[PDB]
Structure formats: C-alpha cells, structure tokens
Design an enzyme around this catalytic site. Structure first.
Site, PDB file in Angstrom:
ATOM      1  N   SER A  32       1.048  -0.732   0.073  1.00  0.00           N
ATOM      2  CA  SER A  32       0.040  -0.130  -0.199  1.00  0.00           C
ATOM      3  C   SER A  32       0.744   1.314   0.105  1.00  0.00           C
ATOM      4  O   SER A  32       0.341   2.232  -0.793  1.00  0.00           O
ATOM      5  CB  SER A  32      -0.839  -0.019   1.185  1.00  0.00           C
ATOM      6  OG  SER A  32      -0.104  -0.218   2.532  1.00  0.00           O
ATOM      7  N   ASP A 147       2.425  -1.143  13.937  1.00  0.00           N
ATOM      8  CA  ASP A 147       2.230  -2.910  12.596  1.00  0.00           C
ATOM      9  C   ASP A 147       3.435  -4.232  13.461  1.00  0.00           C
ATOM     10  O   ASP A 147       4.182  -3.914  12.727  1.00  0.00           O
ATOM     11  CB  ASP A 147       2.747  -2.385  11.760  1.00  0.00           C
ATOM     12  CG  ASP A 147       1.622  -3.288  11.408  1.00  0.00           C
ATOM     13  OD1 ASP A 147       1.056  -4.227  11.367  1.00  0.00           O
ATOM     14  OD2 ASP A 147       2.328  -3.288   9.901  1.00  0.00           O
TER      15      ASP A 147
END
Ligand SMILES: CN1CCN(S(=O)(=O)c2ccc(-c3cnc(N)c(C(=O)Nc4cccnc4)n3)cc2)CC1
Ligand SMILES: CN1CCN(S(=O)(=O)c2ccc(-c3cnc(N)c(C(=O)Nc4cccnc4)n3)cc2)CC1
EC number: 2.7.11.26
Lengths: 350, 350
Positions: A32, A147
């Site tokens: 992304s 993350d």
C-alpha cells in the site's frame, strides 16, 4: 551495472548532503505504502534498502520525521534520504536509504512450521529480547510502532541480530489526543484495537510482541481469525472471559455487549510440554486484557525468560558470540533506571 | 455405519418434536463457533448439515431465533434443531440441522484463479442475483447477516442454486441501538466498519456483496490488506479520497484524521477490457462511501446486469434450466413493491 548517483541528506546528525552511488537495484517488496528496493552501495559494496513512498504535497512525511530521531542497534537505521522522479510523472517521491537485513521472522518461522519444527528457544530468547529493546527505545520518545508482526522483524542469520522495520504506521502517542483504531495487522491487534478504542497506549506493541512470542513457541498464530469476532473468541478461549472492569479498561462504550462464558484456560495447556515455564510466564504477563497490567518492554527484557542471555558463557549454536545485548543508554533505560541492576549483568560491567 | 436417533424440533411451524435418525456423520468444517458435520437422513437419503455450537442456558441462541423465522430459496433452511453433548457432564450443545449445499463461491472462484480463468459472467449473474434476493429477504425483517464473504455463499454445481449460510454474526439492527464494529471478515468490511462505526445499517451487507462481485470479475479480492489502513488505501485507490461529508456519513469522530490524496479512479480502468459495462456500473453503485447512496439488495436484483436472467430463453451452460428466480413474496418486495414490474418478467410462472 546501471549506477545511480544521488545527493542525499544523512539520516541523523548534520544536514550536510553527500553523493551516494548505488547499483544492482532489485525490488524486495510492494505494498500500500509504495516499493522497497535492495541496492548495493558502489563505494563500500554494502547492501542497503531504499523505501520509495510518494511525497504528499500538503505535509512533511511522518515516517521520515520519526526515522531521523532514532539510533538503535535493533532498529533499521535511516542512512540517507532524498527526493526523486518515481513511477507517476509530475509526482515527487521520498526515498529512505535504510539498513538491509536479509531475512524476516515471518520467513524463518514459516520454514520451521513447513518442516513441522519449532524455532530453537535460544533464538526465541535472542529475537524477543532484541524486539523488546527496540520497543523500550521508541516508547521512551513516546513513539508507538503500531504494526508489530513477524514481517516487520528482520534478522541476520549469522549474527542473530534482529532489526525492527516499517515505521509507516508509527506515531507519537500524546495522552488525551485520539488515534485511529484501524492500525495493526490481523492476529497481532490488542483487544482495545478490536473494540475500536482511540485512547490506546504503546501497550498495543507489547500485546503484538506477546503474539509474536506465542507464535514462535506454538508454530502458528495464537489468536487467528478473519474477523474481530473470531479473534476475540480465540483470546477468550486462552485468557478466559474479560471481567466488567477489564472491558472498561480497553473500550468503555463496549461494556454492555455480551460474550460467551469460557473459564480461564491454563497457559501450560496452550503450549507443547517441553516449553520453558518462563516462556509461558512471559506470555501471560504480555497478553493481558488490561493495557496497564501488561509488562513494559524494559520490564520484559528483565524477565527470567531472558536470563540465559545474561549468562557470561552464552554462545550462538553456530559457535559465534551473541550480538550486542547490554549496551543500554540513559534514553532506553528512562522508563525505569533501577532496572539496569538486572539488565546489565556483572560480567558486562567489568 | 452409526445410526443416531434424536428428538428434534422442526425449524419452522409448530413446536412439535419428532424422531430424526441420521447416519454417515462426517466433519465438513471447524471454526471459532464450533463444528459443522455432514450426515444423511435415514428416512429420505437427503444430505444435511449439522452446525453444533455450545449453548449456555443463561440466554437463548441468537442464530437459532433468526433461523426459525427464515424461509427463502437462497438461504440454507433450518430443518430441525436439538440439544446434546460432546465435551463435559454440564456442557450442552445446540445442534442446527440445515440444508447441505455441496460447494462454495470461495472454492469455485479459486479453481478459476488457479486455472488463470475468470468465472463465466452467466455464473456471476446467477450467483450475485441470488445473493441479493437472500439479502432483500433478511433485510425486510431488519436482519443484517454481518459476514458476507465467498465462504458463506454455498452453491449446487448442477442447479446453479446459491444458498447463504452462517447466521452466527446475524443481527436485527434497530435504529438508535448501537452495534459492535468488529464483525465482518477482512476484504469484505464496509469503510464505516473499518472506521469503527456502531451506528451502521444493513448497507454493510451490500458493500460486502459488491466486494464479492468485483472479486468474481477480477479473479482476486478488490480491497486486500492485513490491516484496516492497507484496506483503506486500496479503497481510496479505486473510489478516490473520501470527502469530509462522505467520512461524516460513515463514522463522524474520524473526520479530523487525514488520508493521502488519490484522484477518483475510473471503474472501467479497474477490470479487464472484456468486462460488461453493466457489471462495472453495478460495482460503482454497490461500492459507495456513503451507506445511504448504495443500492438496496432489491434495487440491485432489478439492475441491467441481471437482464440476461430475465430472458425467457436463458439456459445454464450444462443445458439445464435456470433455478427459481422470480418467486418473489410480498415480504421480499416490501422495501419497493413497484420493482416487481422489472423483477417478475412477462413469461414468469403462470
Ligand atoms: C531478496 N529477497 C527478497 C525477499 N526476502 S524477504 O521477503 O524475506 C525480505 C523482505 C524485506 C527485507 C528488508 C530488508 N531491509 C529493510 N530495511 C526492509 C524494510 O525496511 N522493509 C519495509 C517493508 C515494508 C514497509 N517498510 C519497510 N526490508 C528483508 C527480507 C528475502 C530476500
Ligand atoms: C468434503 N468437502 C468438505 C469441504 N467442502 S467446502 O469447503 O466446499 C464446503 C463447506 C461447507 C459446506 C456447507 C454445506 N451446508 C451447510 N449448511 C454449511 C454451513 O451451514 N456452514 C457453516 C459454516 C460456518 C458457520 N455456520 C455454518 N456448509 C459446503 C461445502 C466441499 C466438500
């Protein structure tokens, strides 16, 4: 090969641009965010990673600002940064020249799983301790990675060095300021995130790191599921049903919504029989419903599970010495300076 | 072969228990919920599925109460239900005796992508239309499935009949009453769900249904990602950046948090060149940021993309007739009764 020469600014220190020449530009990742390349520094022959993201015309890159502040042996260093042409015409691209670390905990754990094996416990200790040091460091600046997942934990197979990467989701968490709850990858998300809390702390990284520990010990993710619902069932199956107050601590608006009533499952029944009691004890203290009840990264480094690393005669299975483990700074010790009594062993002092 | 005889209550109608005998018990699936078995009814030879879940009597099973109301040709029927054991002399299991449908959209679509093929659009039309009929039906009772995904869409390969299954996440949505945002499987979650909205409507199923359409057309998920963040980037790449009013409509508290500026990508540039314009037009009207701007299931059945199904000469590729497609009830048509002028074609059942 095709030599690229750029004028890049060094990541840390004085803003004194340098000519950086690199060759052998291969792609190592897509996502992304953009693209991650591998290249060889013409000069040294050294391998680097170039993370190429798109320059948002409105504001300064958040990841770049974070990278610039950091210098730790267990975090991928921002060597240089520069602006370029990219894929899209008339569009500006930010290029982050980083340390290249050859493997990921994801690929390594996957070799073991496919071969019907677990990663030897010494590696689980080395990798986990290093992860907690990197977390102790970033947390001391108020920065939450957001993350933590095996794909973001890089390894050098020879040195046993672990390096945290991907600061694309990283943020400075300020008390009272709200934050998006849609960060953090499936399997590794803290229950507060699943419940949609926007008032969460850096303890989300500690939950995520506990999920990595349990996965390295089990050989598969501890809390799988393709929905929050399925993930929550797996958590409840291991941790028991969360109490009224435990739910209140995570997300308060979610106190009425009812869950199935399952009894507190013993962590000794979760892992295989030859699992060290200290590995289990660590999991239970990382994987807590109450975010404030979870160990801090620095308190996890000082846990009995990592005692073997503090042995003066500790060696890697390949005969080599263990990597840097005790070079703590005042910055990384700041959350609890008295922990250095355990953290830096007598041999490291001499 | 072990013959099991139980005293089971029929799903619909009078609460008059009867003896149900079944053989050839075989596990067909495992999940957070429990286990799904396949068995053969002794007196008929009919294959059935038995969904076995643990039932705590400190509440009635929500899925069972929903199942008992439902009667549609595109929804798996609750034939019987009964109580039994499996694990503990206190542990009581609810057993739901359902219709058995042999394949899934997931497994079918996977054969095609491995074969480097797309599912012939006649099947995309048949499967999608049937899904929207099932959604038009449940929505008319105020019930939202909340887990629309290719694995929950069953198919009979011979008749081309699609049956929706898994009512484990299904809920009657009452305006003003808040609902958990952690429902719905990754790739299929509406943006409002990603933003943590608790005031969402049945339009979440319509978003999910659109994600299935686009996947059947592309041969891979339209909005992948292991985090909400990555999923949102994929949505923004296709739909363009959401306006502040579009964001307000989904979840209001997230109006401040900024996203990258991506221009509104043309839906025609998303799919392969031989994709029907009506397939793309349907996607664009299902996959809307504004939940109130999305087509309703009943309005989607009436879309030009499904016109071929309304042709009196349409036949399946195997030479068989198309299944039931026009047997709409007043219940099923309630959201927009004038739609029947399009829905029921001139040649339909006289
Ligand atoms: C050439 N091969 C490609 C396949 N792998 S891999 O998938 O195991 C792998 C992927 C990325 C890295 C790597 C190395 N150095 C880095 N510095 C980064 C990095 O910063 N990655 C990253 C990823 C996502 C977002 N941001 C940063 N990644 C290492 C191995 C082995 C090597
Ligand atoms: C032997 N094979 C097992 C593999 N498959 S499968 O994965 O394609 C498959 C899985 C489930 C069903 C099935 C059939 N009838 C049902 N009624 C249900 C069902 O109700 N499933 C369900 C699943 C999750 C939660 N609740 C209900 N499932 C059919 C095919 C094909 C046959």
């Amino acid at each position: 090969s095709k030599v690229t020469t750029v004028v890049a600014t060094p990541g840390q220190g004085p803003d004194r641009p340098q000519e950086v020449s690199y060759t052998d530009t291969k792609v190592i990742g897509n996502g992304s965010f953009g693209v991650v390349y591998q290249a060889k520094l013409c000069d040294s022959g050294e391998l680097v990673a170039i993370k190429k993201v798109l320059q948002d015309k409105r504001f300064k890159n958040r990841e770049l600002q974070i990278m610039r502040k950091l210098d730790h042996c267990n975090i991928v260093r921002l060597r240089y940064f520069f602006y370029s042409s990219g894929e899209k015409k008339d569009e500006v691209y930010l290029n982050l020249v980083l340390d290249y670390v050859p493997e990921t905990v994801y690929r390594v754990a996957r070799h073991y799983s496919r071969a019907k094996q677990t990663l030897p416990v010494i590696y689980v200790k080395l990798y986990m301790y290093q992860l907690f040091r990197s977390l102790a460091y970033i947390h001391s600046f108020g920065i939450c990675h957001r993350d933590i997942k095996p794909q973001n934990l890089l390894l050098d197979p020879d040195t046993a060095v672990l390096k945290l990467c991907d600061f694309g989701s990283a943020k400075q968490l300020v008390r009272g300021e709200p934050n998006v709850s849609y960060i953090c990858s499936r399997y590794y998300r803290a229950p507060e995130l699943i419940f949609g809390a926007t008032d969460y702390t850096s303890s989300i990284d500690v939950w995520s790191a506990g999920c990595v520990l349990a996965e390295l010990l089990l050989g598969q993710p501890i809390f799988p599921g393709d929905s929050g619902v399925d993930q929550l069932v797996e958590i409840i199956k291991v941790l028991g049903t969360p109490t009224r107050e435990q739910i209140r601590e995570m997300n308060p608006n979610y106190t009425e919504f009812k869950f199935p009533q399952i009894k507190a499952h013993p962590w000794t029944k979760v892992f295989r029989p030859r699992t060290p009691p200290e590995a289990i004890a660590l999991c239970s203290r990382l994987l807590e419903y109450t975010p404030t009840a979870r160990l801090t990264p620095l308190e996890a480094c000082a846990h009995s599970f990592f005692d073997e690393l503090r042995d003066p005669n500790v060696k890697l299975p390949n005969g080599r010495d263990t990597p840097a483990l005790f070079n703590f700074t005042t910055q990384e010790l700041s959350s609890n300076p008295p922990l250095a009594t355990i953290l830096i062993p007598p041999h490291a002092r001499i």
